[PDB]
């Protein structure tokens, strides 16, 4: 799974 705190600026759903 992606680490969603790799870059907090990324919203993975859009």
């Amino acid at each position: 799974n992606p680490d969603p705190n790799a870059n907090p600026n990324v919203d993975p759903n859009a």
């Epitope: 799974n1 992606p2 680490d3 790799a6 870059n7 600026n9 990324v10 993975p12 759903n13 859009a14």
Partner: antibody, heavy 121, light 114 residues
Framework: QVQLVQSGAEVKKPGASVKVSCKAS????????IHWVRQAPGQRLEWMGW????????RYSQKFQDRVTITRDTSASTAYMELSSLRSEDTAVYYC??????????????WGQGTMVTVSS | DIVMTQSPDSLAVSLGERATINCKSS????????????LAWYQQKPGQAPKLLIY???TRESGVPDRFSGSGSGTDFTLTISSLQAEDVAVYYC?????????FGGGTKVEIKR
């Protein structure tokens, strides 16, 4: 007109510390994360860490996690990076960046102009 | 730690021909839960900070010319410049944001043959 504006070039002695400011204007300062990315002479882009500009919370690259300190001052719309125990290998251009702000409401990416730090006596 | 390896490290094509830049991640960066590859492409011209061209491996950033296209999936990606303009001279980087730490490739210097 979203702008990130960094402090001017500096020369610091080996073992000293350097602090680079990154003024961020044109948008809600507390909304996004400001990253710090450096680039040595002739070498690649190297991510150092980010700071959540609202939270104040941080993540540092492992390589730098005992040497780097990233802060923010919301009233001054400014992020800062500090690098201690400098070595000549740290001679580089340091950037702040709003890296890949990906949203359905516009995806944008905005870098500072970069700051030259020379480690030298 | 995901490492990013680009090939070639420099290429030289005559104006109006395609420039092909390849990039490999040491691990998969496709998220099968949302079918998105966590890859980006930057173009960095001398004296300047990198500029974003492509994200999600193949979506163009607002304002980027159509000759810039990214493809690939999983662990193999490619930046294709379909007709190289004089002003496309720069070093190009791929960039993963699947896992922390964020990492970039080594760069592909793209230069015009004339």
């Amino acid at each position: 007109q979203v702008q990130l504006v960094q402090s001017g070039a500096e020369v610091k002695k080996p073992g000293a510390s350097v602090k680079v400011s990154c003024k961020a204007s044109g948008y809600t300062f507390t909304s996004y994360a400001i990253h710090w990315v450096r680039q040595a002479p002739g070498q690649r882009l190297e991510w150092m860490g980010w700071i959540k500009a609202g939270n104040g919370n941080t993540r540092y690259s492992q390589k730098f996690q005992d040497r780097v300190t990233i802060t923010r001052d919301t009233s001054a719309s400014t992020a800062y990076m500090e690098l201690s125990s400098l070595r000549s290998e740290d001679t580089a251009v340091y950037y702040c960046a709003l890296l890949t702000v990906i949203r359905q409401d516009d995806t944008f990416d905005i870098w500072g102009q970069g700051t030259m730090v020379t480690v030298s006596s | 730690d995901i490492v990013m390896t680009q090939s070639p490290d420099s290429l030289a094509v005559s104006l109006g021909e395609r420039a092909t830049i390849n990039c490999k991640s040491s691990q998969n960066i496709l998220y099968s839960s949302n079918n998105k590859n966590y890859l980006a492409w930057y173009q960095q011209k001398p004296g300047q900070a990198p500029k974003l061209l492509i994200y999600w491996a193949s979506t163009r950033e607002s304002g980027v010319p159509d000759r810039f296209s990214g493809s690939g999936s999983g662990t193999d990606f490619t930046l294709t410049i379909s007709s190289l303009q004089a002003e496309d001279v720069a070093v190009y980087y791929c960039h993963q944001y699947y896992s922390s730490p964020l990492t970039f490739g080594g760069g592909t210097k793209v230069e015009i043959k004339r």
